[model samples]
Target: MARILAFDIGISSIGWAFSENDELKDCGVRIFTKGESLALPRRLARSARKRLARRKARLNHLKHLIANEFKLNYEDYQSFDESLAKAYKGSLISPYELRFRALNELLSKQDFARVILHIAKRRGYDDIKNKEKGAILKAIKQNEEKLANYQSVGEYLYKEYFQKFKENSKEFTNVRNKKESYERCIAQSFLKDELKLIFKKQREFGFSFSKKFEEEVLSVAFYKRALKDFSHLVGNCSFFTDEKRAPKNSPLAFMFVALTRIINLLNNLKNTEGILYTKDDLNALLNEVLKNGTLTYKQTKKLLGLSDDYEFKGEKGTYFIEFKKYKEFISQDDLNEIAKDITLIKDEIKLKKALAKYDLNQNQIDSLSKLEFKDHLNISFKALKLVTPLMLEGKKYDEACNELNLKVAINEDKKDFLPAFNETYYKDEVTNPVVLRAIKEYRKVLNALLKKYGKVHKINIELGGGYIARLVLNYTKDYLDFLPLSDVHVEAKSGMLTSALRHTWGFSAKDRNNHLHHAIDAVIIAYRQKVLDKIDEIFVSKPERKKPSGALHEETFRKEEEFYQSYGGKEGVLKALELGKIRKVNGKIVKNGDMFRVDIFKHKKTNKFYAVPIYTMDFALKVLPNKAVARSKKGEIKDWILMDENYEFCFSLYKDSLILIQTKDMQEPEFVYYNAFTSSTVSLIVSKHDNKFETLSKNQKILFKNANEKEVIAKSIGIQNLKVFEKYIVSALGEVTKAEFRQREDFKK
Candidate 1:
């Protein structure tokens, strides 16, 4: 019996099915929370914290060094600084004035030291190698020259910025406006020159300064770490081990990749009558892509002389376009020569000089010089050299690779029953956490299935969104070698056609919104040996409000009492008083709104429904609620039955937990998914059953009625109940795997 595996990979869910002798044997959907949801905000916060911390450390280190140079203890120096402020009567002379005065007249040693420290603090823009720095550097030089006419930097700043603001005002104008139009910042080199000039004059006025001390201070203030080189980290070419990957943006590489893509497009390209494009037509399309980096469907139709009504299948509009800016000055032949010379000439300067021999201008030379050709391309220059001719000859990528005897498979020969889990291999190749996770999940599912069924005969994968074509190609080919499979086919089935297929198979749109559609898609993919197939709350799990990080309240505390009066001084606290928006813990007000989870309770006497919101800290401490606060007529907390008094705990509702809800007028309880909750009401979505294409209102309101009246009752339903609604999946051939239910661990019972 031939055991074939099929997969319908999706962003949040991976639907897979197994077939033996071309009959469905087993299938499942591996549902996972999308990694991007929490990862993005947490990654952003971590990056921000790291940058701020580093800046703080650098400034502190600079301050410590300056204090050490002055030979003053921390406390002593702080007192001396205070005394200097008192001497100037709280209106101290500006550091820029001290900088100018020290250059000409004698100054106190403490005041002279102050000028040096001030210059050290504001070290200017320092990226030397960046091309864009030229404009900013020129501006800095112009500002430095302007200091020649002024008595001091402070005097020049006041005249140019402050005095201008003073003269222009009908209303008061700020010297430092929001746009920073009059802002003047000097370069580090200019500041260094002033420091040197001031030190020389101070020395002549009998103030001693040592060379070693000066050097140490200058090193501490002006040091910048060299830019890190990532060249060594570049991957080698797939075919040529010795040659590293070429620059992806290089003219030759760009054209080669573009041609390969267009050729593949041409192979599948057909007119309304299903006639394939001619050789001349292929050449015409290829030439268009080479000349102009993209060929839109409209442009392509015009080029092919097709009618305006002709609709091309696949990605609508421009599908193929250049990844980066293309250099028009360099020809294909010129680019080929440069690519070859890049391997020979190791030094950038030497490479630029050699580039000029090709009759290129300085701008063109600089453009090519700065272009970083890395190993982003799997093929090396040697491989590219061989493959380019065939691609130009209208052969597809696989055809070209196969003709050149480059094995598309990582392991050409079948060896093991299961591929080895090479953690290091994937870690180096796949950097995206989501992609890496999907790949690992794919491997895990495959290995588990392989262990159950003896040997695999073939594998079919429906290449879905979020998967790069290159990764699927290489991995699937590698899998062919690992398993006893003779053939492996990977294709992307049209989503529209897949939906149509589902409808033809008697599955309804109601079945789509339910989770089982993922498994159904997998089953469809598996059966098509002939065919190919294809919130709400944002309940943030906020940490304990142990210490306040941001402002105590919203910004209007100072201006208008409208906002302040509304929120009881803090924005969320006012809501807390009326509707559990905040919690009072240890006599301190902390965030109570945006509950991560809520436990449903039923009153024993009144038979009324109540949802008690639980926050992260409450969940962590395992704090069980006894009572839920209700809103009075004036939005004040009213006493409700404590859990011990009359309530019985029911199953909790999490972000996406499945539940059966029956409102007052409903004939039967409809399956709904829990989204989020407000203090008075919980948000739910009416679950649709068959096709994934079915659309439903997201915010299906379920209002909590008065304690005496019965309105809405929601009961916890396992995801397995989805099969009850999706009758086809329950009736389909094969032992269905148990649906995975996502619920809070404590609420599992």
Candidate 2:
């Protein structure tokens, strides 16, 4: 049911095929010579001086052609041949125009050199006047050589045909050279004098590559090339006869001639914005097609939308400008693809949001303007994005947040879940995390205070960095006791979280109280319920919280009231931590030969990371060198190096042992004495060969274990290597052994 138009857009021509109703057919193609149709005229127009010189040559050639062949007198020739001369002049003008126009039609190809040429041409550097101009000069030198050979062939043709005429020219003295050249040559055809001027201009203007290519193009041209062909196909071509053939001039041949021209043009249009796309670029493209309305890759693939170009982008989400240089585009149905490929965008982002993605130069504007509607849609997408700042300018923070979230959430259900931005955007944006965190934290504190007092006092907690603002909380109060009670103490206005807490704890200023009663007793009554609720919440998770295996903290009763009184404990510590006012480390404990740091964080278990104080870690290492690191220094150590590099601590996981190794960056092994600060990362210790290797099991004779216990817990196996290192440490130490004691609840029972 869907119609497909596939185009292979090239530098100067477009090849396209349309498919519908199970049929595929080429729908013809069109070509505009690189410079002739658009940019070449403008490129030449830039230098009025050079353009004048080139036109002068064209005029002279026209005049010479008319006068030499027509046999009419000069004045008569001008009148009879003016129209025909104009057509000849047009041919001369066209290539130069093509050369200059090439700057634009060049399609900004990947040949960065050509791109540079385009830039030069735009700046009026088409010929050898500036730059090294090698392409131009080399072409002329080669042309002069070709002319020599052609003239040699001409001498033979003249001598053989007109040998009966008496030799008269004094310039004919070089008889041997002429006769030798003639004798050696065959029919090496070429344009001479005025005819030669056609390509001579090409050599002079530095269009060597294109001119050489067009040579084949001209050779293959179906009509009016050779002297005989010109006489037949274009009667009186060198004179002033009929310039336009009636009905159709060589209609059958013109098609092939035009096809040749198209072929030349196609070569020029190799790549542009998306003509050659990468894999990811292509997939994104096809997915974009599915969204904006196009067949899926599967369908297009089944229909054979691919070719030898595996790296070709259009096959997947990729597209090819395959022919935009020839004035073809993303195809009419996919024209909205300007929104898909930034190449089609040609608007100011300040004016169009989607245009923001496009790198719009004046060239792109001029280029995409040729594909009007395609560019328009891209410009529109950019325009839609422009509303962001305006929306912010008019709405409040939460409204803006909700709007942003809504736009970002659309693809959430999709696996790709592509947001308007990348991962860094959500994780590091001020508009997302910072504001969101602050809002949520405020809401949580507000709810907590409100639940306790039955009224949320308007406590303002303002952010301190950059642009900061305050928030207000409002609710109705309910009395618990006579307790200086007001059934509805609607508002408690202040600008601090602590103020909110004070009011929630029934400690409002007594001097301003209309009830004239103290508020401390009511706070005491509510405080107990709060403390018990916290206890239950904590206990629901764990009893002892399993203070690291060898450490000594027990999970008995929590002396909350005593602790609270001692250091204003729970509230004090929690508030202090909340205010970022603690040492952030120091909870460490050790028992037996095993060293355990109460503060050490297991990164894998927690998925949380923060740097511990180097000094603290060093101290822990001093206590647990075997677990953390071993170090020695040979030379004098500077304080900075000691702090930064003198200690290197690493965590390693082995078969059944986790080792933390430490050494300075440059400490020599032979160093006699060195002091290093290091610490144990974990409480447990297991080496390659440990102090203990096996435990007495209830049933199995031998037991085995490793770090990741995936298979059976332990087979009847013992440490294979412990026999050698066992002599260094006691094998009797049960906790120090690398073994697992397993039973069916035997130990607990």
Candidate 3:
């Protein structure tokens, strides 16, 4: 008999079931009570602020470097720096500033105004106090009108319009009314905002266009010369050494250069401390340096406490090296003495040792307390190879955990781990890349388990989608056609289904190992055998009567009516629904409401015409759901439960699923919903296109009054709004091209 493994995977809880010889042999849950997302934004904010601080520090440091190199005073150093500058007649204060200034000088009278207008056109300008945004808008509109009238603005107006705000705002008084200075100010404001964002996230892929625009516009001879000279002074200089080149006089070049300097100093110290600097290891250090801009190693010798030599020791082993000998190893051209400094670490201290070198902020280090067991394992992986293989391979969670429980439990000590930390963590850290490595290791261990026993028949999983699901699927895609027999169809409510599952797996609330989810996975795995045996005869191969367009269902028409009525009136709601199909429901429209609609969509991919029974508004409020956050006795959030009214009903899309695109804010209805089904996943890229189309009401009352309610509803459910729907479809499934997107048929009325 083929063995099976089942998983009930979630961000906070990971439960596993090991089935062998036609019986579940072991099962358990790994409860990471730590909320991975709760403190993340805080950590990122904290890190970003720290990064900006370091950037400021490095700016001072770079100034210091230039001054020290030239033997000059600090504040007077900008004069000697040669790169400290901007454009126009009086703009040559610094060469870095000149790059932007020079670029502005290159633009025509018309082009300069357009560039300034482009940046001014960004949203939220109207919302700002004392910004003269209205005047800027008027200036932009008048210029655009002028351009329309003559197919170009007169040079007279173009030069003067550049100073349109200068006459009113004191901030612009000194900045000449000429085109060049105005262009410089606009480019200057955009770059300032961009720099702050860069400090937090050194790389942002989506904003590459903005980066390109800056690079293209800011190109100048002075900028290149200053960059070349500065980079040559630093030991490490490459295209990617800094995110952009033209801004070389900016603190970014200093940050990156100092970053390499800090890493080199730390690596040298580690070499004497008996640490191996592998190519991969060094690369990771480089990445970390760039990311956090951690330490510039201001006083390297003082931090290391280096005298004559350094040594590392433990109960079993010790490594010692003379400073002279290590210097010889490092100084040699062909010799990689740093590579010879590798050490074997068996404790958590090594992780701490690596972190200490970074010159971390207290908050950043505290944020490290939030790191999952998976993270510690990442740093300590190869060294803890003794413990990892068994931990990964062992069937029972408790048993494996006991084997690796070498350290005292956190609670056993007075240490307050995961302390009250408030900081934003802006890295792409939904899950670390190291977690993927752990997933790969787990897959290998599981494969070994399967080989030792037998082939896995079906790995039952509840809700087989999301990060954790993809983690397993990515590794096991080749092994089985459908490695997981997912219970995506079944909705496990609080009572009957969960009760039956627990009972079958011999679990109770009062049990010692109260892993309620493992029992649920066990039930799914056990039940699938007999279910799969006769699936074709009974469930799969069962004949279907030619159904109506779609099934009828309802939650409460009165509720949708009240929801719409609260937003002002039913004209917009009713009108929006009229734009699409509203299959009938048993419930009649109650007081103060109209009957809302839903439609069935057929997502055809090859032989499969997947029937997605999309019931209308009254019956489909449950489809796009929300949750009520639970609170502790202390009145803090403990967990979030599905909101009762929304999650009460189950509306499955059969073999497919619904894609809900709901707006979070801006003058739209509070509860406007639309639904549809597609063959593949849907990507929600909400555009500001709605604002361009119509005037939407700002009030909670009488809102969505003059809005594109019809178009919004049509586009929400992938019905009408052909162009946007086509774009969305093309993005989701690469099969559709620009030609096909244009030629694609609209949804049936």
Top candidate on lDDT is 1
Quote the lDDT for 298 in model 1. Answer: 69
Expressed as tens digits, the lDDT of each residue in 100-132 for candidate 3 is 332224433222322322222221122112234
lDDT of 2 by residue, 356-419 (tens): 3455555554454443222111112222233334332433223544665533211122111111
Off by over 4 Å in 2: 1-436, 448-627, 632-749
Q: lDDT value for candidate 2?
A: 0.27
TM-score of candidate 3 relative to the true fold: 0.22
* Model 3, backbone clash pairs (residues 3+ apart or across chains), number: 22
lDDT of 1 by residue, 506-620 (tens): 5545334445566667666666332222211111111111221222222222332333444445543445444444445434455543456666666666666666766655544
By TM-score, highest first, what's the ranking? Answer: 1, 3, 2
Best by TM-score: 1
Cα displacement (Å) at residue 735, model 3: 49
Local error of candidate 2 at residue 636 (angstroms): 13
